[PDB]
Amino acid sequence: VHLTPEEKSAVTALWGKVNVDEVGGEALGRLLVVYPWTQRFFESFGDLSTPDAVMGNPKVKAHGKKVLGAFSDGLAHLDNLKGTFATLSELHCDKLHVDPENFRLLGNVLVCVLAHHFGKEFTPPVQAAYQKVVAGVANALAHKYH
Amino acid sequence: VHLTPEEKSAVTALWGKVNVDEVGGEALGRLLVVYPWTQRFFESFGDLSTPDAVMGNPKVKAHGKKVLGAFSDGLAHLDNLKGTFATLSELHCDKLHVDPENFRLLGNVLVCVLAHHFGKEFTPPVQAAYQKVVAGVANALAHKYH
Amino acid sequence: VLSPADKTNVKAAWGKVGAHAGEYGAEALERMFLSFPTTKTYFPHFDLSHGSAQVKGHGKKVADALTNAVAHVDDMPNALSALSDLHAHKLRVDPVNFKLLSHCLLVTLAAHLPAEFTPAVHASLDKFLASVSTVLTSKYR
Amino acid sequence: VLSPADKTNVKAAWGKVGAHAGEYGAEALERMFLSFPTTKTYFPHFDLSHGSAQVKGHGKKVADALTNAVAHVDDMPNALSALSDLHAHKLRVDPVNFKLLSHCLLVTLAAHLPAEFTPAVHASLDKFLASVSTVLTSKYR
Ligand code: HEM
Ligand code: HEM
Ligand code: HEM
Ligand code: HEM
Numbered sequence: 299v300h301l302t303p304e305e306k307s308a309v310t311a312l313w314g315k316v317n318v319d320e321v322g323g324e325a326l327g328r329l330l331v332v333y334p335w336t337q338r339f340f341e342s343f344g345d346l347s348t349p350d351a352v353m354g355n356p357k358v359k360a361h362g363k364k365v366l367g368a369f370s371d372g373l374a375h376l377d378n379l380k381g382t383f384a385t386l387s388e389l390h391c392d393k394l395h396v397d398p399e400n401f402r403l404l405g406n407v408l409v410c411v412l413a414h415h416f417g418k419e420f421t422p423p424v425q426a427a428y429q430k431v432v433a434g435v436a437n438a439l440a441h442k443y444h
Numbered sequence: 445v446h447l448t449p450e451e452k453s454a455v456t457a458l459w460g461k462v463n464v465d466e467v468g469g470e471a472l473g474r475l476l477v478v479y480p481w482t483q484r485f486f487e488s489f490g491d492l493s494t495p496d497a498v499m500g501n502p503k504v505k506a507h508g509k510k511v512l513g514a515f516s517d518g519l520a521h522l523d524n525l526k527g528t529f530a531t532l533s534e535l536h537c538d539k540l541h542v543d544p545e546n547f548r549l550l551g552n553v554l555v556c557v558l559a560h561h562f563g564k565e566f567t568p569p570v571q572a573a574y575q576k577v578v579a580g581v582a583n584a585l586a587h588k589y590h
Numbered sequence: 591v592l593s594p595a596d597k598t599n600v601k602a603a604w605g606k607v608g609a610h611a612g613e614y615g616a617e618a619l620e621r622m623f624l625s626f627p628t629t630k631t632y633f634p635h636f637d638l639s640h641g642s643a644q645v646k647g648h649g650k651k652v653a654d655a656l657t658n659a660v661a662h663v664d665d666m667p668n669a670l671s672a673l674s675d676l677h678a679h680k681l682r683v684d685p686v687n688f689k690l691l692s693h694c695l696l697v698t699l700a701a702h703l704p705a706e707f708t709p710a711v712h713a714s715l716d717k718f719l720a721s722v723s724t725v726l727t728s729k730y731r
Numbered sequence: 732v733l734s735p736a737d738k739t740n741v742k743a744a745w746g747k748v749g750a751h752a753g754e755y756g757a758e759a760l761e762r763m764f765l766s767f768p769t770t771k772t773y774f775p776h777f778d779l780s781h782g783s784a785q786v787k788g789h790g791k792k793v794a795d796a797l798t799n800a801v802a803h804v805d806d807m808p809n810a811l812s813a814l815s816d817l818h819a820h821k822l823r824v825d826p827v828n829f830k831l832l833s834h835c836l837l838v839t840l841a842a843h844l845p846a847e848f849t850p851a852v853h854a855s856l857d858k859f860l861a862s863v864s865t866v867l868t869s870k871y872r
Contacts, residue, residue: 338823484682
């Protein structure tokens with residue numbers, strides 16, 4: 299993955315305004331609601347019975363915070379996403395057997411959350427830069443399948 | 445991509461029996477018939493109006509021979525598919541803008557052609573080894589998108 | 591399959607676009623061209639730069655097709671049949687690309703209608719656009 | 732959408748499976764488990780090794796479902812509705828996996844019925860299995 303300096307500036311300027319305690323839970327909760335087969339992997343999380351139950355589930359929020367921290371790490375290492383995500387790839391591919399299409403889906407749910415939270419500031423060029431980021435994260439996470 | 449020695453043996457033993465003048469045209473022709481949006485890229489090939497027209501089109505056969513030669517090269521370099529496919533990646537991604545899902549589809553059409561031609565010899569373990577091969581070729585061909 | 595709640599959710603959310611329909615369709619197209627450059631090759635006769643009158647006009651057509659699908663959500667194969675023939679037979683659009691425009695339509699709605707874009711409505715809109723996409727990719731032959 | 736020729740082609744090809752239906756369903760499952768190991772995790776209660784009586788029995792069930800879809804090809808959403816509920820609601824099967832089993836069913840038919848597996852019939856069978864897959868992934872909620 300290829301971000302120009304102007305894209306990197308756009309990406310990191312927005313990211314500095316992200317609430318890192320909340321956005322990862324919003325994205326994970328929306329993944330579980332919008333793509334409900336993904337719930338197969340979260341049986342121990344308890345109540346996922348309704349959108350409100352999912353979004354207010356404290357385990358979704360807490361786990362989402364971990365997910366977002368991994369995205370933050372990718373943002374800090376755009377030129378070595380593979381190294382950055384190696385152990386997470388071993389976990390998600392070799393141990394959990396998550397189909398890697400779902401990595402793309404979660405990246406795109408995060409893009410939708412950023413659009414929702416930033417509104418007109420999430421311009422088409424800013425989105426294009428974030429699509430490069432979430433594509434690179436998904437590809438790195440899927441490395442153990444390649 | 446990861447082939448064991450027993451998979452490599454299975455793969456190369458079968459490949460030595462492949463008719464290299466015919467199988468690539470059979471796979472490309474079946475791609476154009478089964479996934480007909482792929483015809484968008486072959487307007488200059490002339491008559492693609494029916495399955496018989498496609499399969500007996502001499503330009504399909506000739507172009508298919510080139511495609512299969514690239515697969516043969518990948519088979520000969522399983523531990524550096526990226527280098528092997530670099531210029532083809534630049535062509536198919538940067539110049540032609542082919543969506544990389546179609547690389548997966550053509551690999552799987554080739555698997556179906558091998559099944560058809562080898563019958564009971566195309567055992568489930570032999571198929572599994574060839575799926576690793578066509579996955580690795582598609583991934584290498586898509587490198588310029590990553 | 592769209593539930594009764596999905597149909598209500600999509601109508602209600604889309605209802606809030608009002609005079610901005612064309613504009614949001616145009617914005618989604620721009621988002622797609624910028625984020626997924628492979629899609630540009632279908633429009634060699636358009637300039638795809640910002641403020642393009644051709645993208646603005648096409649966005650009104652895309653929005654009109656989506657309103658048709660909302661208005662005839664129980665008969666979508668029939669409502670979109672001509673468009674399905676066009677995209678598959680004449681235009682040969684790769685089915686992958688419908689997922690890309692659908693995502694960009696979701697992003698555009700999220701960027702303009704934050705009160706409407708709740709997790710439940712997001713899910714309904716995703717199912718709706720996936721159903722539109724299934725119809726528009728149903729005619730390859 | 733399946734044309735009249737696609738329906739004829741699928742019936743005719745599947746017609747040649749005869750007493751081997753169960754066996755070919757079982758073989759396709761084995762092909763899927765070996766080629767796409769992520770799919771194995773849905774069957775922790777089965778042994779997936781060659782000659783497994785559990786895979787043999789499941790292959791007969793998969794084949795029976797496909798014959799139902801052939802026999803009711805004009806009403807497939809209805810014919811497969813219970814199975815669609817099972818795969819989405821209870822089993823939470825990832826939609827990607829239907830593409831993998833569909834490919835393995837094509838490979839199995841090609842390996843056994845070479846005279847039937849012409850390019851036109853291949854195309855019809857692919858469209859048929861994609862339609863089955865669309866129905867079986869239509870109920871997520
Ligand atoms: C872009 C995509 C994703 C990112 C960056 C990501 C990130 C992470 C992180 C940082 C962890 C915690 C690892 C820890 O405890 O050391 C995690 C755990 C896990 N993730 Fe993800 N994830 C991704 C996608 C997904 C998807 C798509 C699924 C399933 C649908 C999933 C399922 C899991 C599960 C079940 C665990 C818990 C594993 C355990 O504690 O044993 N992940 N993920
Ligand atoms: C696994 C996948 C594929 C392999 C290995 C492959 C291989 C090749 C080869 C070896 C060439 C000839 C390059 C030459 O003249 O130097 C070629 C040309 C081309 N391929 Fe593919 N291909 C793949 C997939 C596809 C797909 C999926 C499409 C479109 C649906 C496509 C479209 C093209 C076109 C249009 C050309 C002609 C380019 C030109 O002469 O300007 N290829 N491909
Ligand atoms: C939500 C999905 C989509 C909708 C509702 C939609 C809608 C429409 C509409 C209403 C037209 C005009 C039809 C004429 O004038 O009868 C059209 C044209 C067309 N669409 Fe789409 N479309 C969709 C997705 C796509 C995708 C994904 C692509 C390609 C990336 C695409 C490429 C085209 C092209 C190239 C034209 C013709 C442009 C003219 O040649 O000038 N469409 N579409
Ligand atoms: C062509 C596509 C498919 C067909 C026709 C099909 C058919 C069936 C049938 C008929 C049953 C038995 C239903 C019971 O006993 O009512 C079943 C069960 C099931 N299927 Fe599928 N299936 C398909 C694809 C898949 C896929 C892709 C997967 C996962 C990779 C899957 C996983 C399962 C599981 C896990 C069961 C239950 C097994 C039991 O818990 O013991 N199916 N399927």
